[PDB]
Design a protein around this ligand. Structure first.
Ligand code: NAG
Ligand code: NAG
Ligand code: NAG
Ligand code: NAG
Ligand code: NAG
Ligand code: NAG
Ligand code: NAG
Ligand code: NAG
Ligand code: NAG
Ligand code: NAG
Ligand code: NAG
Ligand code: NAG
Ligand code: NAG
Ligand code: NAG
Lengths: 306, 214, 224
C-alpha cells in the first residue's frame, strides 16, 4: 500500500474513457456489420443517414481479459477499502503496475463477469439524490445466468430473490430505512436498454428482464418455478452502443450459441417520484457501457510521474 | 515537525511588477518537496507550483519557483490583477506536511489620510439598555492604523472591537470601523467621548470627540 | 475535470460530534487518488488533519483518537465520497474544513513523497462553527449624521445578514463591514455610506437588513 492520501473520482475517471474507446476499436475489427447507419447533419435539421456496407464475417466474438499497465512517466494508483464510494479521498491507496484482468463485457441492465464486491453488496452513484444518475450495484456474490441462442436464459430464482433483497436492503440504507423498496421493469426506451441486452457468440441477445425486476417489498414469485427463465431474442438489426445509429449483423449460423456468465452487478435507476411517500421505484438501467467500465475502474486512477 | 517561516508578512505592489516571496524551512529539504498555493478572499486555495519549481497544468508561466540552502522562493513576474491575494508555502518532505503563515500581496497606492467620523449611541439603542459608540475611518492608505478610545480622558482597554474592509477594487483604499461598547449605566455617567486616530497620512494624531447630549 | 463538492455549513454545540462529506466528481476511484483533509481557522493559516491513501486512513498527532476518516467508491447516482468525523467538538474546532485530492497513480510525479503530499484539487470548504448560541434576529440602530451615516446591526446569530441601501438604488460610497464576534457569542456589524452634506435634508436614506435564519427583515430610515 502507498503511504499517502489522494482523491479519486470513478465518475470522472479518465481510464474509463480510455478503455471504452479501446473496447470500441476492439469491436471494429471483430464484429463488423453488413450495414451501419449513422446520423449526418450539418445542423440544418435535415439529416442524411451515412450508410456503410462491409463484409459480415460470422466470428464467435469471445472477449479476452484486458490489463492496463502504466507505460512510463505514468503510474496507476489503486484504492483499497471494503466499501469505497469511488468518489473521494482514499486512505489505503497503493501504486500498481497493471489493473486486474478485466473482461470487457458490453451489456445493459446486468453486469456480466465483472468483479465481485469483497465485503458486501455496494452501490455507487455519482449522486443518489439525482434520479437521473445511474446507480451501479456491485454484487458480493454473483448469480450465474445461462443464455442460449435457443431463445432464453435461466437464472436461479433463489439466488435472484436473495440478491434483490441484499440490494433492496442496501438501497434503503441510502435513501432512508423507513422507505419501501420496489423493483419495476424498464420505463421505456430502446430495446437494448429495456431488456437485458448483451452479446454472446457474436449474437446480440435481447432478454426480457421483467421477471428480474418486478419485485415488491412484500410478495414473492416461486410458485411452480425453480429457475427464472428470461425469454431472450437474438436481433440482427440493432442500435449501436458505440455511436448513435443502427447496424445490421448477419443471421446466426453455428449449430449452437451458449453463455454462462456471472451476474456480478447491476445498473439500476430509481425514478424521481418528486419527493413522494417512501416508495422508491428502481428499474433496470444502463446502455452507457462506460458505467460498465466504471464499475471495474471505480478504484483506479492513472497519474503522471513526479 | 518541520517549521516553515514565511517572509514578508505583507507586500504592496503594482500591476506589471516582479514580486518575491520567501520561505525558510527549519531543516534542509534535499528532495525539494515544497509547494506554493494562492488563496483569494472567500475562496479555496489553489496549487500553483510543486516540487519547488514545477508548474501545475493551467498555471500561468509568470509564476516560478526557486531554492537556495534552506530558503525557497516564489517569484511573480508581470504582476496581474487576478494575482493579488494571499500566498502560502508548504513542505511535504516529512510527516506531517506543514504550511507557512502566509503572505498578503496588496495593491500599491499613494498615501491617503482617513476621513474620520464618530457616532454617539442612538436614542433607540439607549432605550433598549445598551450603548455603542462607533468611530469610522474612511478610504485611507496604507492599511496600518491606530485608534484609541478615551472617555472622561481615560484610555479604554478591552471593551472595543475593530473591523476592516477588503482593499477596494477601484480606489485601492481601506475603510475601518471601531466600536466601543458599554452599559447604559456608565455611558450616562461620563461627559466626553473621544476617538484618537494615528496614520501616516496625518501630520499629527487626529481626535474626533463629542459631549454627551449635544 | 475534478470538482470536489463538500457538505454544507454546520453550527454545532460543544461536546457534540459532526461528519462532513466530500463528493469527488471526476475522481475514478480512491484506489488511484489520495484524500487529504485540511482546516483553516479564521484569519489563520492552514493545518493538516489526516488522510486516506490506498484505502488506508490515518490522522496527525494533534487529532489522533478524535477523528475518523473514511472513503467509498460509488457510481451512477453518486461519485466517490470521502467523509471526516470529528468527536468532542470545542471552540478551537471552529474553522473551514477542506477536502483535498491528489492522484497517486504515477510514482514519479513529484506531487507525493511516501504518503506526504501536495494537494492538487480543493473543495469549496465547509464552515463548522462551534457555539452554544441559539438563533436570534438582530436589532437595527441608526447611525445619524461630505457627511457620513449608517446602520448598526447588533446581536444576531448565526451568520449571515445582508444589507442594501434604498432597496439597492444607492451603492456608491457604501461600506458594509465584516461581522465581528462579540464576547456574548453573538455577531454585530455596521454598514456606512458617505454622502454630500447638502442633500441631507433633501434625500431619504434607508438601510434594508435581512437575516434569513431568523426570518427577520427590517427597513430602517436614517434621519439627521
Ligand atoms: C444529404 O447529406 C449530405 C451530406 O453528405 C448533404 O451535403 C446534402 O445536402 C443532404 N441532402 C441530400 C443530398 O439528400
Ligand atoms: C455480502 O456477501 C456475503 C457473502 O459473500 C453475504 O453473506 C452478505 O449478506 C452480503 N451482504 C449483503 C446482504 O449485501
Ligand atoms: C445531487 O443531486 C441533486 C438532485 O438530485 C442536485 O440538485 C445536486 O446539485 C447534486 N449535487 C451536486 C452539487 O452535484
Ligand atoms: C449454467 O450452466 C452451468 C454449466 O456451465 C451449470 O453448472 C449451471 O447449473 C447452469 N445454471 C442454470 C441453468 O441455472
Ligand atoms: C422513519 O423516519 C424516522 C427515522 O429517520 C423514524 O423515527 C420514523 O418513526 C419513521 N417514520 C416513517 C416514515 O414511517
Ligand atoms: C416481456 O417483456 C415485454 C416487454 O419487453 C413485456 O410486455 C412482457 O409482459 C414480458 N413478458 C414476461 C416474461 O412477463
Ligand atoms: C409485484 O406485485 C404485483 C401486484 O401486487 C404482482 O402482480 C406482481 O406479480 C409482483 N411481482 C412479482 C412477480 O413478484
Ligand atoms: C420457492 O421455489 C424455490 C425454487 O424455485 C425453492 O427452492 C424454495 O424452497 C421455494 N420456497 C419455499 C420455501 O417453499
Ligand atoms: C463465473 O461464471 C461461470 C459460468 O457459470 C461459473 O461457473 C463460475 O463459477 C463463475 N466464477 C466466479 C466469478 O465465481
Ligand atoms: C463471461 O461472460 C460472457 C458474457 O459475454 C460469457 O459469454 C462467457 O462465457 C463468460 N465466461 C465463461 C464462463 O466463459
Ligand atoms: C402515499 O401513497 C400515495 C401515493 O400515491 C399518497 O396518495 C398517500 O397520501 C401516501 N400515504 C399513504 C396514504 O400511504
Ligand atoms: C470524548 O472522547 C473522550 C476520549 O477522547 C472520552 O473520554 C469522552 O467521554 C468523550 N466526550 C464525550 C462528551 O463524548
Ligand atoms: C503510513 O505510515 C506512516 C508512519 O510513519 C505515516 O507517515 C503515513 O502517513 C502513513 N500513510 C497512510 C496509510 O496514511
Ligand atoms: C490499509 O491500511 C489501514 C491502516 O492500517 C488498515 O486498517 C487496512 O486494513 C489496510 N487495508 C488493506 C488490507 O490493504
Amino acid at each position: 500500500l502507498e503511504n499517502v492520501t489522494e482523491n479519486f473520482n470513478m465518475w470522472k475517471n479518465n481510464m474509463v474513457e480510455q478503455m471504452h474507446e479501446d473496447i470500441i476499436s476492439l469491436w471494429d475489427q471483430s464484429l463488423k456489420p453488413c450495414v451501419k447507419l449513422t446520423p449526418l447533419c450539418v445542423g440544418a435539421g435535415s439529416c442524411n443517414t451515412s450508410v456503410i456496407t462491409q463484409a459480415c464475417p460470422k466470428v464467435s466474438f469471445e472477449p479476452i481479459p484486458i490489463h492496463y499497465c502504466a507505460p512510463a512517466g505514468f503510474a496507476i494508483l489503486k484504492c483499497n477499502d471494503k466499501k469505497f464510494n469511488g468518489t473521494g479521498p482514499c486512505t489505503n491507496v497503493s501504486t500498481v503496475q497493471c489493473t486486474h484482468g478485466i473482461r470487457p463485457v458490453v451489456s445493459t441492465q446486468l453486469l456480466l463477469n465483472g468483479s465481485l464486491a469483497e465485503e458486501e453488496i455496494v452501490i455507487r452513484s455519482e449522486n443518489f439524490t439525482n434520479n437521473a444518475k445511474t446507480i451501479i450495484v456491485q454484487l458480493n456474490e454473483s448469480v450465474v445466468i445461462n443464455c442460449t441462442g435457443a431463445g432464453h436464459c435461466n437464472l436461479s430464482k433463489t439466488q435472484w430473490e436473495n440478491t434483490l433483497e441484499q440490494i433492496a436492503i442496501k438501497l434503503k440504507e441510502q435513501f432512508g430505512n423507513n422507505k419501501t423498496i420496489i423493483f419495476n421493469p424498464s420505463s421505456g426506451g430502446d430495446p437494448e436498454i429495456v431488456t437485458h441486452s448483451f452479446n454472446c457468440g457474436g449474437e446480440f441477445f435481447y432478454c426480457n428482464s421483467t421477471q428480474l425486476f418486478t419485485w415488491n417489498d412484500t410478495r414473492k414469485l416461486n410458485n411452480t418455478g425453480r429457475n427464472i427463465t428470461l425469454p431472450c431474442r437474438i436481433k440482427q438489426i440493432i442500435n449501436m452502443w458505440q455511436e448513435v445509429g443502427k447496424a445490421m449483423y448477419a443471421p446466426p449460423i453455428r449449430g449452437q450459441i451458449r453463455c454462462s456468465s456471472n451476474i456480478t452487478g447491476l445498473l439500476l435507476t430509481r425514478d424521481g417520484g418528486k419527493d413522494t411517500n417512501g416508495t422508491e421505484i428502481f428499474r433496470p438501467g444502463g446502455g452507457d457501457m462506460r458505467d460498465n467500465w466504471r464499475s471495474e475502474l471505480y478504484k483506479y486512477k492513472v497519474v503522471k510521474i513526479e | 515537525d518541520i517549521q516553515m517561516t514565511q517572509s514578508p508578512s505583507t507586500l504592496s505592489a503594482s500591476i506589471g511588477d516582479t514580486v518575491r516571496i520567501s520561505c525558510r524551512a527549519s531543516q534542509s529539504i534535499t528532495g525539494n518537496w515544497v509547494a506554493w498555493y494562492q488563496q483569494r478572499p472567500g475562496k479555496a486555495p489553489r496549487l500553483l507550483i510543486y516540487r519547488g519549481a514545477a508548474l501545475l497544468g493551467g498555471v500561468p508561466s509568470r509564476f516560478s519557483g526557486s531554492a537556495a540552502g534552506t530558503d525557497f522562493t516564489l517569484t511573480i513576474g508581470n504582476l496581474q490583477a487576478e494575482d493579488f491575494g494571499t500566498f502560502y508555502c508548504q513542505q511535504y518532505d516529512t510527516y506531517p506536511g506543514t504550511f507557512g503563515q502566509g503572505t498578503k500581496v496588496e495593491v500599491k497606492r499613494t498615501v491617503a489620510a482617513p476621513s474620520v467620523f464618530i457616532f454617539p449611541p442612538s436614542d433607540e439603542q439607549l432605550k433598549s439598555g445598551t450603548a455603542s459608540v462607533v468611530c469610522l475611518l474612511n478610504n485611507f492608505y496604507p492599511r496600518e492604523a491606530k485608534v484609541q478610545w478615551k472617555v472622561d480622558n481615560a484610555l479604554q482597554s478591552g471593551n472595543s472591537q475593530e473591523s476592516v474592509t477588503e482593499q477596494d477594487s477601484k480606489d485601492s483604499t481601506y475603510s475601518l470601523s471601531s466600536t466601543l461598547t458599554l452599559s447604559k449605566a456608565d455611558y450616562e455617567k461620563h461627559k466626553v467621548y473621544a476617538c484618537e486616530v494615528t496614520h501616516q497620512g496625518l501630520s499629527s494624531p487626529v481626535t474626533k470627540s463629542f459631549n454627551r447630549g449635544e | 475535470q475534478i470538482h470536489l463538492v463538500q457538505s454544507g455549513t454546520e453550527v454545532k454545540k460543544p461536546g457534540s460530534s459532526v461528519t462532513v462529506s466530500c463528493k469527488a466528481y471526476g475522481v475514478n476511484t480512491f484506489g488511484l487518488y489520495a484524500v487529504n483533509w485540511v482546516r483553516q481557522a479564521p484569519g489563520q493559516s492552514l493545518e493538516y488533519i489526516g488522510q486516506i491513501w490506498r484505502w488506508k486512513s490515518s490522522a496527525s498527532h494533534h487529532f489522533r483518537g478524535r477523528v475518523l476518516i473514511s472513503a467509498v467508491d460509488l457510481t451512477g447516482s453518486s461519485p466517490p465520497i470521502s467523509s471526516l468525523e470529528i468527536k468532542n467538538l470545542t471552540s478551537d474546532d471552529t474553522a473551514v474544513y477542506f477536502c483535498t485530492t491528489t492522484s497517486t497513480y504515477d510514482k514519479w510525479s513529484g506531487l507525493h513523497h511516501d504518503g506526504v503530499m501536495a494537494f492538487s484539487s480543493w473543495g469549496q470548504g465547509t464552515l463548522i462553527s462551534v457555539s452554544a448560541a441559539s438563533t436570534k434576529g438582530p436589532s437595527v440602530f441608526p447611525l445619524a449624521p461630505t457627511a457620513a451615516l449608517g446602520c448598526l446591526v447588533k446581536d444576531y446569530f448565526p451568520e449571515p445578514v445582508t444589507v442594501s441601501w434604498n432597496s439597492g438604488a444607492l451603492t456608491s460610497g457604501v461600506h458594509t463591514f465584516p461581522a465581528v464576534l462579540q464576547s456574548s457569542g453573538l455577531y454585530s456589524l455596521s454598514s456606512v455610506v458617505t454622502v454630500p452634506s447638502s442633500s441631507l435634508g433633501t434625500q431619504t436614506y434607508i438601510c434594508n437588513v435581512n437575516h434569513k435564519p431568523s426570518n427577520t427583515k427590517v427597513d430602517k430610515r436614517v434621519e439627521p
